[PDB]
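Tokens in:
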């Protein structure tokens, strides 16, 4: 199931779970490989397989996601081939105030609307997303990234994660 990527493109980004590389097979994609010690005791090949499945399940259910295309491996490194989001902001950087949303009005509106839309689905379908986490593309759209699992259950923990990010957009929009 895991495909060999012989060569990697330039490295891009700063996420802690995975190191990300431009795909030399498709400039719309990137190669995302687990860092050491990020999958706990679970083998990396399982973690990657579970992320691809969950990403596809959420995509089917209507959620906005960073799409995942293939399980990949490079030397001893294991991971997933995913859509590349140019100039993406990581939502953990935003909520932990390491980075900030731009001032742009349209940008913050998109963050607000998409956060609302994600919460609506979580309520309608009554699901909880393990390790819920997002990327914000350069227009402000919010995409679920590296989901670990989706299960029918109370969505309140997940709705709180979204609200966490939404608050920053609210605070900016309330500033005229």
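Residues out:
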């Amino acid at each position: 199931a895991f495909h060999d990527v012989p060569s990697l493109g330039q490295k891009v980004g700063a996420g802690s779970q995975k190191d990300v590389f431009h795909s030399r097979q498709d400039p719309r994609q990137c190669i995302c490989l687990f860092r050491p010690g990020t999958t706990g005791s679970i083998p990396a090949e399982q973690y990657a397989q579970k992320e691809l499945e969950t990403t596809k399940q959420l995509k089917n259910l209507g959620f906005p996601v960073v799409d995942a295309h293939a399980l990949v491996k490079h030397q001893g490194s294991v991971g997933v081939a995913k859509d590349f989001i140019h100039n993406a902001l990581d939502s953990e950087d935003i909520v932990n105030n390491k980075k900030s949303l731009p001032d742009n009005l349209k940008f913050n509106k998109n963050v607000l609307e998409d956060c609302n839309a994600i919460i609506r689905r979580l309520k309608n379908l009554e699901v909880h997303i393990e390790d819920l986490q997002f990327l914000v593309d350069h227009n402000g759209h919010v995409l679920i990234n590296d989901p670990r699992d989706v299960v029918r259950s109370s969505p309140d923990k997940s709705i709180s994660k979204v609200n966490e990010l939404r608050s920053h957009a609210l605070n900016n929009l309330l500033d005229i």
